[PDB]
Design a protein around this ligand. Structure first.
Ligand SMILES: Cn1cc(-c2cnc3cnn(S(=O)(=O)c4cnc5ccc(Cl)nn45)c3c2)cn1
Length: 285
């Protein structure tokens, strides 16, 4: 039913399927070992995405689109890269790079003081990598639409990788009240113009990066804790802006505030942010 693509196909018997990964939150995803991706007698830990049992024609369409998006966008150090696929004679498998330390929010929380604590340079370095991944995605004209620490994955070598940048999402079907599996409301990462007017741009992604920065320097803090949807609307209509996190230089809080500029055109680009974080890293102890 699915067209062959020898650029990416891997025979099913090269994939030893392992434990479920996301508890279901991010689609049907399992750890797996791939024999001879590159090198034919080496195994590589990878993550594999497939369709659930009760999956519609629309569900299959979506997974294909995401795979094809990964094909077009090309490779970068700081994004989750496509590695291969099994599309013939069985269920669609999309093989992607595996991030053994989980998402950036959990990785930060697991390293709060009362597992080793992260230095100031480590935290600014985390932000630089995430902005590098976003700079690359933007240069390829990709808009994430849901950039947050929960969608940054951390590899065994502490490499930050943006995840889920290729998902198919009908923005006019978002459940504003729907909560993450952690209990937070994704609307708290959306730029006002995206939330109120359904207008998604590279500039709204930069707003979301500002919130992500706030997550880094609170070591996994929760934005607007206790604030339900309707009151978030009020706070944004009134121009509310989160407070400076403790142990956060005034410079890095100005970056946050600059990302949260009321006027989208006045926010910095990811290209700008990368240049600035690069400089700030070189100057952090
Ligand atoms: C399609 N795709 C799947 C992975 C992938 C790679 N390595 C791991 C390790 N754990 N998990 S995870 O439990 O499912 C999880 C925890 N937080 C998140 C946020 C976003 C996503 Cl996609 N998954 N996730 C992984 C998922 C990359 N691309």
């Amino acid at each position: 039913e699915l067209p062959e693509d020898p650029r990416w196909e891997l025979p099913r018997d090269r994939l030893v399927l392992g434990k479920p990964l996301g508890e279901g939150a991010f689609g049907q995803v399992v750890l797996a070992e791939a024999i001879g991706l590159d090198k034919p007698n080496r195994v590589t830990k990878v993550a594999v995405k497939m369709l659930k049992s009760d999956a519609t024609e629309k569900d299959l369409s979506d997974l294909i689109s995401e795979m094809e998006m990964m094909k077009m966008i090309g490779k970068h150090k700081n994004i989750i890269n496509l590695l291969g696929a099994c599309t013939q004679d069985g269920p669609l498998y999309v093989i992607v790079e595996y991030a053994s330390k989980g998402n950036l929010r959990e990785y930060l929380q697991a390293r709060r003081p009362p597992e080793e604590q992260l230095s100031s340079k480590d935290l600014v370095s985390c932000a630089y990598q995430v902005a590098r991944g976003m700079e690359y995605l933007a240069s390829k004209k990709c808009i994430h639409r849901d950039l947050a620490a929960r969608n940054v994955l951390v590899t065994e070598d502490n490499v930050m990788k943006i995840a889920d940048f290729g998902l198919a999402r009908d923005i006019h079907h978002i459940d504003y009240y729907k909560k993450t599996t952690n209990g937070r409301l994704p609307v708290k990462w959306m730029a006002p113009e995206a939330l109120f007017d359904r207008i998604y741009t590279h500039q709204s992604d930069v707003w979301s990066f500002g919130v992500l920065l706030w997550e880094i320097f609170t070591l996994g803090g929760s934005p607007y804790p206790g604030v339900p949807v309707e009151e978030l609307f009020k706070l944004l209509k009134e121009g509310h802006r989160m407070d400076k996190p403790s142990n956060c230089t005034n410079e890095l809080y100005m970056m946050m505030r600059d990302c949260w500029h009321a006027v989208p055109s006045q926010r910095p680009t990811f290209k700008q942010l990368v240049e600035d974080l690069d400089r700030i890293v070189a100057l952090t102890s």
